[PDB]
Amino acid sequence: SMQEEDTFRELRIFLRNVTHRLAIDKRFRVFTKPVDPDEVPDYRTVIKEPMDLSSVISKIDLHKYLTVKDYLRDIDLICSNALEYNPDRDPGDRLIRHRACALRDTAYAIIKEELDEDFEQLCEEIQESR
Numbered sequence: 001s002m003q004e005e006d007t008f009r010e011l012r013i014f015l016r017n018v019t020h021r022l023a024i025d026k027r028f029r030v031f032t033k034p035v036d037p038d039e040v041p042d043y044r045t046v047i048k049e050p051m052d053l054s055s056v057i058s059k060i061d062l063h064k065y066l067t068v069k070d071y072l073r074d075i076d077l078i079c080s081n082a083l084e085y086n087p088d089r090d091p092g093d094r095l096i097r098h099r100a101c102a103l104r105d106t107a108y109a110i111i112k113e114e115l116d117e118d119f120e121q122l123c124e125e126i127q128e129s130r
């Protein structure tokens with residue numbers, strides 16, 4: 001229905017606004033673009049599904065997310081990719097892990113404060129009907 005398409009348009013507006021607030025935070029610069037093959041040719045052999053905040057905005061615009069849950073699976077994949085690729089005790093690895101955990105926790109905290117639980121349940125019920 002037209003009302004259902006208006007629901008999904010509101011979901012996309014919400015997700016673009018959360019993603020922009022993450023992307024401008026200086027702590028999260030390392031997560032704003034895909035990893036360059038030139039800097040890590042090793043990256044794509046270890047990490048089987050790369051993800052970054054630029055790719056997330058492209059996916060919002062392609063209508064890939066019909067619920068906040070499916071958006072948070074990609075935020076969680078940005079974080080888990082960084083924890084798995086950079087697991088060592090040295091300071092460079094510990095700094096990117098701390099920033100990855102902060103990206104995840106910040107996204108969840110904005111959603112907790114600003115998403116209406118009844119809006120998310122409506123998106124889930126439209127998705128399940130298709």
Ligand SMILES: O=CN1C[C@H]2C[C@H]3O[C@@]2(Cc2[nH]cnc23)C1
Nearest residue numbers: 030035039040081082085086096
């Ligand atoms: O050597 C400098 N770089 C290679 C990468 C290693 C580490 O920082 C990256 C980008 C990225 N993403 C996850 N972990 C890293 C840029």
Ligand SMILES: O=CN1C[C@H]2C[C@H]3O[C@@]2(Cc2[nH]cnc23)C1
Nearest residue numbers: 111112113114115116117118119
């Ligand atoms: O279910 C979760 N809630 C937390 C709030 C955030 C968001 O939805 C609210 C109420 C409200 N008013 C404006 N924006 C919202 C209820």
